[PDB]
Amino acid sequence: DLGKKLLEAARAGQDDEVRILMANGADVNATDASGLTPLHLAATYGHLEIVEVLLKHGADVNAIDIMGSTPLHLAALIGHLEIVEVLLKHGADVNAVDTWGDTPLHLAAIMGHLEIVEVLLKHGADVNAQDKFGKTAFDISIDNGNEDLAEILQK
């Protein structure tokens, strides 16, 4: 198989196996055993130009998995500013639903990464989108203990 090597190539963070594997006709969006594309893994563990040369080689800027996560779910959660800015530059989803009901703004809010909220909201995040436990995005900040996250959710 030639999608496995690309999957663990964008996950381990490399420039060579993301330059001449899609060259051999490798599935640019090849998944694994539950549904992670090499863009989830290039956006997730903290790698930049792999998401700029992958998202210009046919990467779906809105791909899901077994529980419902997108590359913006797995970039607003960990905390990589430039990967959320670029992932939104191609037209990602700021109001995606997964099996536990969370949206990427709930995940960037839970993990206390605040500028990801500063740009996820300015690009149209829904403050009235609730989850499996019936709490909005403005209902995460008042239960967290973080005032700086409740200041951007009421502005």
């Binding site: 997730t44 563990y45 529980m67 996560s69 797995l74 959660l77 960990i78 905390g79 536990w100 969370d102 995940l107 839970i110 993990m111 206390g112 990464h113 239960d143 967290n144 203990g145």
Partner: protein
């Protein structure tokens, strides 16, 4: 019960251990080199609680310093009172963890642990009445959390009748760079609830908040916090470095503080608040001292006690003032806020007073608070954690180092029963 053997590991832990030994080596009167340069003998009645004696007026801090990063030790040698450390007690690894718990617990810490156990051994072979063990570390990183918990487990299974005290600090996405921290945190808690006796909680979030709002330091450095923690350390160790009936040894200390074996997570707090090297001209009085050190604006953990109820409290006042004033303000806060105390534990707040004040102050006050509100600190982590373990990110780090993966959800069930335990004893009236 007299001798206390102290240990520091991890970046944060070694740092705060240094700040501790600074302020207390000045308060006890030891010079940088290691000779008694004090004035009052009040600083030597219980000096043996933290120093061995090398004959010739040499006060060797009964301490041990560890790290898997070979660097770290440099920050020790530049520590102005750092030459006083015993040569043999320097045990420094050379691999480094890089914010990884299983690397410190099942991998390389598993290699250096038996090297530390022997120096601890020859430290206990020269103690008259060895009290217990007192540790300093951090929870979000790699070395401290993991190797710390393993060390505590082995000491526990070699010394079961000695008190287990830990001064642990908290991760938060306000100071932590990486985000592998809501994993190492829950692991560390999983081991702490089951292996330790006492545990003091310091939240990085609180120290950032205090450095920004109060001290007006918009750009908080990483020593600005070590100041704030070392102060609290002197405040809560006063009961063990100076004479007095209240909180004599550590056993007594936990006795009036630990109502249930698992619930042992304190929320320290100090008044007044100062920056580094800035003394107090209008030094604080008494009603503002106790009116502050029971408010939330001076607490050391991001936990509003006004939401919960206090199980036990141990207040400590330092300096020269009026005794009646002290006890009176104590009971005043108690009964004007008897709605914040479990009325089914009475006489729950114990207050002592010590003569020698801390450095830069003439009157100070320390706080130690086993509250039911501390669960808010553990409902936050189990939120940063359940949002990252339901996704399984970075699990090849730990699981790919001999770790079980279910030793995670074990910790989630453990901490999520702990939260229900602090919520349990919040609304139980004396029926």
């Amino acid at each position: 019960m007299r001798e206390i053997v102290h240990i520091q590991a991890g970046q944060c832990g070694n740092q705060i251990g240094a700040k501790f030994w600074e302020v207390i080596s000045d308060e006890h009167g030891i010079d940088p080199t290691g000779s008694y340069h004090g004035d009052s003998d009040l600083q030597l009645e219980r000096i043996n609680v933290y120093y061995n004696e090398a004959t010739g007026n040499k006060y060797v801090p009964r301490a041990i310093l560890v790290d898997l990063e070979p660097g770290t030790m440099d920050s020790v040698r530049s520590g102005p009172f750092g030459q006083i450390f015993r040569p043999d007690n320097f045990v420094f690894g050379q691999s480094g963890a890089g914010n990884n718990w299983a690397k410190g617990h099942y991998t390389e810490g598993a290699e250096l642990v038996d090297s530390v156990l022997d120096v601890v051994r020859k430290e206990s072979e020269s103690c008259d009445c060895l009290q217990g063990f007192q540790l300093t570390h951090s929870l979000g990183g790699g070395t401290g959390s993991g190797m710390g918990t393993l060390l505590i487990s082995k000491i526990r299974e070699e010394y079961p009748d000695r008190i287990m005290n830990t001064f642990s600090v908290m991760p938060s996405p306000k100071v932590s760079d990486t985000v592998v921290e809501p994993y190492n945190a829950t692991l560390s808690v999983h081991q702490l609830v089951e292996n330790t006796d006492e545990t003091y909680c310091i939240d990085n979030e609180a120290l950032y908040d205090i450095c920004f709002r109060t001290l007006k330091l918009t750009t908080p450095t990483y020593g600005d916090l070590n100041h704030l923690v070392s102060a609290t350390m002197s405040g809560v160790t006063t009961c063990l470095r100076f004479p007095g009936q209240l909180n004599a040894d550590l056993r007594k200390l936990a006795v009036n503080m630990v109502p249930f074996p698992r619930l042992h997570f304190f929320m320290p707090g100090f008044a007044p608040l100062t920056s580094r090297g800035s003394q107090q001209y209008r030094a604080l009085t008494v009603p503002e001292l106790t009116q502050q050190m029971f408010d939330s604006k001076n607490m050391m953990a991001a936990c509003d006690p006004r939401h919960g109820r206090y199980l036990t409290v141990a207040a400590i006042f330092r300096g020269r003032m009026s005794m009646k004033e002290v006890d009176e303000q104590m009971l005043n806060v108690q009964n004007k806020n008897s709605s914040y105390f479990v009325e089914w534990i009475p006489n729950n707040v114990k207050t002592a007073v010590c003569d020698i004040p801390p450095r830069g102050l003439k009157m100070s006050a320390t706080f130690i608070g086993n509250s039911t509100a501390i669960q808010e600190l553990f409902k936050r982590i189990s939120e940063q954690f359940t949002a990252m373990f339901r996704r399984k990110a970075f699990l090849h780090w730990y699981t790919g180092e001999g770790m079980d993966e279910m030793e995670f959800t074990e910790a989630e069930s453990n901490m999520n029963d702990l939260v229900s335990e602090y919520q349990q004893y919040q609304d139980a009236t004396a029926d």
